[PDB]
């Protein structure tokens, strides 16, 4: 077997600790292959019916060629991106065995390169019909509300629908989490017995139907891995929960106003009631909000007029498509929350301001921690046991909601010694402003958890203080992980920077200085966070300068078909994310890092009795003729191991037991 969990560390068969420097592969699994429907093409979007993700990311011939890149860049892990839509697209229980068979073929090509792969059931604002990716289309018809009218009802601002796809608002897809469809789907997914207790399919609640199929669609895809025989523990080490779990409306103390914890707006900003009227064809005046130095920004209101057409399936449209039972309680043509007594369609006025406020069964007041410790963990325990009904030795990458307190599983029955805490972190300023500010940055984590009062005691000035701020944020998350969940490993499964900074300034000049300072600062935070590894958010094989990641106007891929590789076109800040890093360490890593300015790699460890320390050294930064190695104890050699013709320089450092450290200096560049 490739890797085992042994507390806070991953260990190889000979007791050496493994460091997971990985990357997400790939952002192309978010949308189908035949027809190739990215975020900007509009024809054929709505007849999802039959899709064919057979092919995404890439055709199998290019697999061994594409995998070779990730070894050359020093990556040893891959977060394999796949959607629930890729498994159960035709309908409930209709699994794409052709997609399964083709995907099993992908893994061994990657296994030939000695990768570590954990599978990611990715999603963004629920479904691709809802302005993102993830869940299949029939899940929306199960809740029933046909995406045709979504345009100006403004439930999920879809990009495959706007008049001009090139004019899709930047970073507006993430706003859908606070809109009608995504607030409804996640609420029904994690707890339908609670807020919409009339949703009964197959005699069971919508909570049990949406979860039961996602739990089963992954379990059936996992049962093939048991029968494959050559990919369990030999390349596939386990699974992840679900990408960025959202609560929807579970815990909204007042649905008539924007909650103070909702810090993202932009586009139209409907409340739950303003989102309720709009999803029923009425009319609302909504404040519109935006972006630093661009967009609405304390805007001036805008009137939304769907004009008599709802964001719901009509009362008579044919459902009889894929099996089908509904209890007569669940209706069509009317608002779901309206029939449950949340609001009156005849008078257009709320019930009150606290339907989504307290506990379904006992009446305890809801918050985000209450949602994370109950309904999310309720969905997580079943997903954990379902994957272990097939493969009990499966490592489960537990991903709680983004930038929220992880569940308190330390000392409970869920203190799983084969679990991994997956944490997301994005520089909220640079990601949303698309500009690396070299002058200030905010301790976002410190503000969210209440370390300081308001974002005024927290902000730090100076690029050095900014670097230390990000590292102490990621370091704090590791201490929060070890406090609530126990002695378990942590993997920063998503972290990156937007490459389209300063109005495509790097694409116009080749000056990637902003992206270099952003990537080096983000990696500097990871290297000092005392974490167990990371996967940079997103390697796209079809990323270009025009469409970015070909998904929601984002441009986060480190690889581009229009940029040059490392030996007026730049290198896409490649010199910033091709870093020396530990691969496998003879003992516990005390501290390591890469100073990109001085081109100096240093690592301090606590040696164990014999078993080597294997470190990746980039060819660009560390040429063999000019690389200078210095050790505090022991001996070292430098080789060029070959893994299917793929070449990368590696240094092995044999040291005795005790406190030792190394300093590797390369070539400085401007």
Numbering used by the authors: 4 to 570, 627 to 669, 675 to 734
The authors write:
ErgGlc synthesis involves a sterol glucosyltransferase that adds a single glucose moiety to the 3β-hydroxy group of ergosterol, whereas SGL hydrolyzes ErgGlc to glucose and ergosterol. Here, we developed Af sterylglucosidase A (SglA) as a therapeutic target.
Full-length A. fumigatus SglA was produced in Escherichia coli and purified using affinity and gel filtration chromatographies. Moreover, the full-length protein yielded crystals that diffracted to a 3.8-Å resolution. Molecular replacement with the Cn Sgl1 model was used for solving the SglA structure. The general architecture of SglA was similar to that of Sgl1, with two domains, comprising a catalytic domain with a central TIM (triose-phosphate isomerase) barrel and a C-terminal β-sandwich domain. SglA also contains a large catalytic domain that forms a cap-like region above the TIM barrel, creating an enclosed Y-shaped cavity, which differentiates Af SglA and Cn Sgl1 from the bacterial and human homologs that display glucosylceramidase activity. The surrounding active-site residues in the glucose binding site are present in the same position as Sgl1 and contain the same capping residues, including a bulky Trp residue that creates a wall to sterically hinder substrates with more than one sugar from binding. However, in SglA, there are minor structural differences with Cn Sgl1 that leave a wider opening to the pocket. The position of this modeled loop does not block the active site, leaving the active site solvent exposed in SglA.
